[PDB]
Ligand binder design. Structure first.
Ligand SMILES: [Mg+2]
Ligand SMILES: [Mg+2]
Ligand SMILES: [Mg+2]
Ligand SMILES: [Mg+2]
Ligand SMILES: [Mg+2]
Ligand SMILES: [Mg+2]
Ligand SMILES: [Mg+2]
Ligand SMILES: [Mg+2]
Ligand SMILES: [Mg+2]
Ligand SMILES: [Mg+2]
Ligand SMILES: [Mg+2]
Ligand SMILES: [Mg+2]
Length: 59
RNA sequence: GUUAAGUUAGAAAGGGCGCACGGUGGAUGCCUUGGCACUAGGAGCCGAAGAAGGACGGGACUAACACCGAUAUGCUUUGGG
């Protein structure tokens, strides 16, 4: 969280895009029946949410 | 022994009264999670910066309640523990 604030508000959105891709792939695997650990969904969702929070509060 | 005349018992297809043992049913007793009437203090409005009240959604599994809103069973920060 504090290490997120060290990024230059442009790599932040690259991180957001990468996380969104990972979340979509996780849901694809869960639907197909090939996801081993399901606790990753919450982690990725919360990571995206806090990226968005930090970007918004920087205005 | 037979005959005649006479007298009196017993019986239950079923039923009645008493008792014993069960079933059904939910009274009664005990209990309280919810109510009723007040007292002292606070507060007596919300909305175009979109209200009151809702619909649909968000969980690994999700029919309902509660919580939340595509940042959705939650995000940042300051304190407590
Ligand atoms: Mg008799
Ligand atoms: Mg007979
Ligand atoms: Mg008989
Ligand atoms: Mg009888
Ligand atoms: Mg009788
Ligand atoms: Mg009787
Ligand atoms: Mg009797
Ligand atoms: Mg009974
Ligand atoms: Mg009764
Ligand atoms: Mg009162
Ligand atoms: Mg179900
Ligand atoms: Mg949004």
């Amino acid at each position: 969280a504090n290490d997120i604030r060290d990024l230059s508000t442009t790599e932040i959105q690259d991180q957001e895009k990468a996380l969104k891709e990972e979340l979509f792939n996780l849901r694809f695997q869960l639907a197909t029946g090939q996801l081993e650990n399901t606790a990753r969904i919450r982690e990725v969702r919360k990571a995206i949410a806090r990226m968005k929070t930090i970007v918004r509060e920087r205005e």
